[PDB]
From a paper:
The anti-apoptotic (pro-survival) proteins of the BCL-2 family include BCL-2, BCL-XL, MCL-1, BCL-w and BFL-1/A1. These proteins bind to and sequester the apoptosis effectors, as well as the apoptosis sensitizers, BIM, BID, PUMA, NOXA, BAD, BMF, HRK and BIK5,6. An elongated hydrophobic groove is thus formed along the surface of BCL-2 and BCL-XL proteins, spanning approximately 20 Å to serve as the binding site for the amphipathic α-helical BH3 domains of their pro-apoptotic partners. Herein we present cyclic peptides (CPs) with nanomolar-level binding affinities to BCL-2 or BCL-XL, and further reveal the structural and functional mechanisms of how these CPs target two proteins in a fashion that is remarkably different from traditional small-molecule inhibitors.
Numbering used by the authors:
A (entry chain B): 1 to 11
B (entry chain A): 57 to 196
The structure:
Amino acid sequence: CPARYGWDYEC
Amino acid sequence: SQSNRELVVDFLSYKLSQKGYSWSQFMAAVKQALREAGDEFELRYRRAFSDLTSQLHITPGTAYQSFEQVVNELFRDGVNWGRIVAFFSFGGALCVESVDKEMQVLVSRIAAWMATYLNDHLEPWIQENGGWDTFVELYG
């Protein structure tokens, strides 16, 4: 998904 | 009785463990990976987590729609495992707030809301993205 939270970067 | 089977599994798991054997249930490793992932999330993302948890305060008056609308923002453009961990940690934080304010009664309700949101919104993504086994391999 579009990265919106710091935890999206580990996915 | 689901209840009777659970009591039997608890006793036999205790007795085997006491003899130095290990009889784990299928969801054992998932539970453990989730506890550890939730701990790591809360420690890594204190700022973002606080902002998430400040978006909702549960009172006896709150409906599921209010919870769902805030969790819908978390998943609005889709699902990843990080967001699933955020959703668990968010539920955790709402339960802690509830008990800090002596509203222990709300914990059951938050648990039902989380189980519904999983069943309707997240389980279909999980089953197409490698199952809880993939979560255990990623985070456990």
